[PDB]
Amino acid sequence: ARFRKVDVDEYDENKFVDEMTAALQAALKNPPSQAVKDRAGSIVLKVLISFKANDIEKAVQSLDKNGVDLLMKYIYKGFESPSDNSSAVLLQWHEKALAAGGVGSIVRVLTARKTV
Amino acid sequence: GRLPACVVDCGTGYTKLGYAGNTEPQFIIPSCIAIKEVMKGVDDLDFFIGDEAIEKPTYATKWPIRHGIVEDWDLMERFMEQVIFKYLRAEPEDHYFLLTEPPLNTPENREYTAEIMFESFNVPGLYIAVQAVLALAASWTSQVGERTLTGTVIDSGDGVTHVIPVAEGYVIGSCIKHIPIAGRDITYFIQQLLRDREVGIPPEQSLETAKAVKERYSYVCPDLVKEFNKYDTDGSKWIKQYTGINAISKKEFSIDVGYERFLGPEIFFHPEFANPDFTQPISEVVDEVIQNCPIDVRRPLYKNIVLSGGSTMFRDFGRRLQRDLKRTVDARLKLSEELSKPKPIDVQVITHHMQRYAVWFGGSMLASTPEFYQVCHTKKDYEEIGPSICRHNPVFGV
């Protein structure tokens, strides 16, 4: 019954195959190896953490919807690397990035096949 | 091991507890717990169980078990605390436990029981035996040379009597039948009979009197008229006296005990005497249950009708059941021979000594055997496979 141990499905030919405010706008530019991706998210993570609790709503509202979507993909990424108040602040970035992009910006985080 | 297993049989009204190997329970107490009635501090511990919990001036009596099944788990769990730590004085981590379950207890209830025993008391081993099988095992003590776990158990406590077919140690659930007549019904009946004839019996003790009379004087007769006759003819030989004491008077009260003696247990056979919604004689229900079981197992069921319950204690009860059933069954084969020669069916009703605590006795015997330790769920398996293992409990002992 060893034959039954090989995932014949892996070779099935039907398996799907994919084909400070200035500082923010600055970091959100040209987004993408998890190395180049992480290097990218770190520069943006670096800028978000370096914000005041009152200078967020002003930077968030100065971005076009596509920008906000990008910011949200980065905010979620931030969540995967806690350390210090970075999470208490990120949750503020989430609050603002959400009021601007709507729950739909989160939907596009989940839907992205090629993400940051 | 050097320490004997713990054996607990929890009934709706009474719990039988003691150590495996013994002939009778070390304690037979009321399945009740008295509590104070937000829980804070060590309030949960303020309670009493059994007799000590029936008339507690400042506590409410509760019955965690309805129709032989646990309803209130919070309360059943505490009850256990005292069963173990106050009465048995057993270190729970050192004894295997054998508990019992009525038929039709769900697999979920077994896991709840298991959760309590392993996660609260840390028992090393657990086995949940089905009451009917233990009863069949208690009867091997009797009239029986070759032991089997196939027979018809007739369990009758204070609630509702059960006619349970057992084949090879496994209850045939789909054929069980219940009878709306049991201990409580008999008492209520005896009570009326007394109210109608006797006087002096304190209303606040109407039941207590009845129950006292049912347990100390009642019995099954073979024929009503003849018994009625006897009492009216030679009243001297059959009318018994019963004295008691008033509660708020202490003045001793006397009353005569008569017909209720044999009339009380008679409602098993003639339910219509007390129940307006049920009329089948017990001997007919048993006959009907067995007929519904697989044919190839019917004769075995007829040869091995075993009793269990304080309500099957009545003298000659089993003798009256056999006669009645022997007829109901012979009569039937009398017609099948006219509309045409089946071998006569052997109907036998076993009766033994440990009948009030039949189930506990069977659990005590089975729990004091090596095989008992082989078929118990260990604490290791519980924690490595999960409480699901306690759903099934291998029959054993043949």
Partner: protein, 280 residues
């Protein structure tokens, strides 16, 4: 029920019923009972040689030789006197009550019988309570292995007697709950300064202890008893409490877990009402 009872209900109730029937002039029934007690104790009540007029109560402690080296036999003789007979095979102490020769009041003998276990324990304590009361120091410590994997250490000193219990928690989580309890004993004197001082060492034994085991599930409780507890007035009570401690502690760890359960049943029940209120 907070404190564990010291007496044994099966012994007391068995003797009681037999003595009652004896007094009533009834014919003797046969009795044959095997039961246990905390700490691996095993008892046997029977009619020696089938003589139903004789009821024997025997106790078996795997660690009896140990208690015997500290005055057990002498103490037991003082308490039971002529009721004490040669020990039944498989047991260390046997009491024999002649149904045909019972005292006027059965109360004391029944009460004393029920305390068989506690009495087998008492000597090691009276012994060391005495050492202190006579300032006799330098006396070797008594080592009692009350369970297969647990030990108690009695030792007298100038102005105090110390009792150290080495207990084991089979449940890893029971250690954590045990610590919460030990913590409160550790501070027990805050509400009773005259009370014994309790100490607790979680994994390692107090310095005072040797071949003492070391493990994540072991725990060392120390009780520092003072004259007010060890003198001839407190003595018995002190002994009644101190010898049931280890079981007192585990009994409460287990009841806590039961209490937690009633909480979890209520919280889960609430959660299920909500979920279902989400159904159209």
């Amino acid at each position: 029920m907070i404190l564990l009872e010291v007496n044994n209900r099966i012994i007391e109730e068995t003797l009681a019923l037999k003595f009652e029937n004896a007094a009533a002039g009834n014919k003797p029934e046969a009795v044959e009972v095997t039961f246990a007690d905390f700490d691996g104790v095993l008892y046997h009540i029977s009619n020696p040689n089938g003589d139903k007029t004789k009821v024997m109560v025997s106790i078996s402690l795997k660690f009896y030789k140990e208690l015997q080296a500290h005055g057990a036999d002498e103490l037991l003789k003082r308490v039971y006197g002529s009721y004490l007979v040669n020990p039944e095979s498989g047991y260390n102490v046997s009491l024999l009550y002649d149904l045909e020769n019972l005292p006027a009041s059965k109360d004391s003998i029944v009460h004393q019988a029920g305390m068989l276990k506690r009495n087998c324990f008492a000597s090691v304590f009276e012994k060391y309570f005495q050492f202190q009361e006579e300032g006799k120091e330098g006396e070797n410590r008594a080592v009692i292995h009350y369970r297969d994997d647990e030990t108690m250490y009695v030792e007298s000193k100038k102005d105090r007697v110390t009792v150290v219990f080495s207990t084991v928690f089979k449940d890893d989580d029971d250690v954590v709950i045990g610590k919460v309890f030990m913590q409160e004993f550790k501070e027990g004197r805050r509400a009773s300064h005259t009370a014994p001082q309790v100490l607790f060492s979680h994994r390692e034994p107090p310095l005072e202890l040797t071949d003492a085991a070391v493990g994540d599930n072991i725990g060392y409780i120390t009780f520092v008893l003072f004259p007010r507890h060890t003198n001839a007035s407190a003595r018995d009570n002190t002994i009644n409490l101190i010898h049931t401690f280890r079981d007192y502690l585990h009994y409460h760890i287990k009841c806590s877990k039961a209490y937690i359960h009633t909480r979890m049943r209520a919280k889960t029940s609430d959660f299920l009402k909500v979920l279902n209120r989400a159904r159209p």
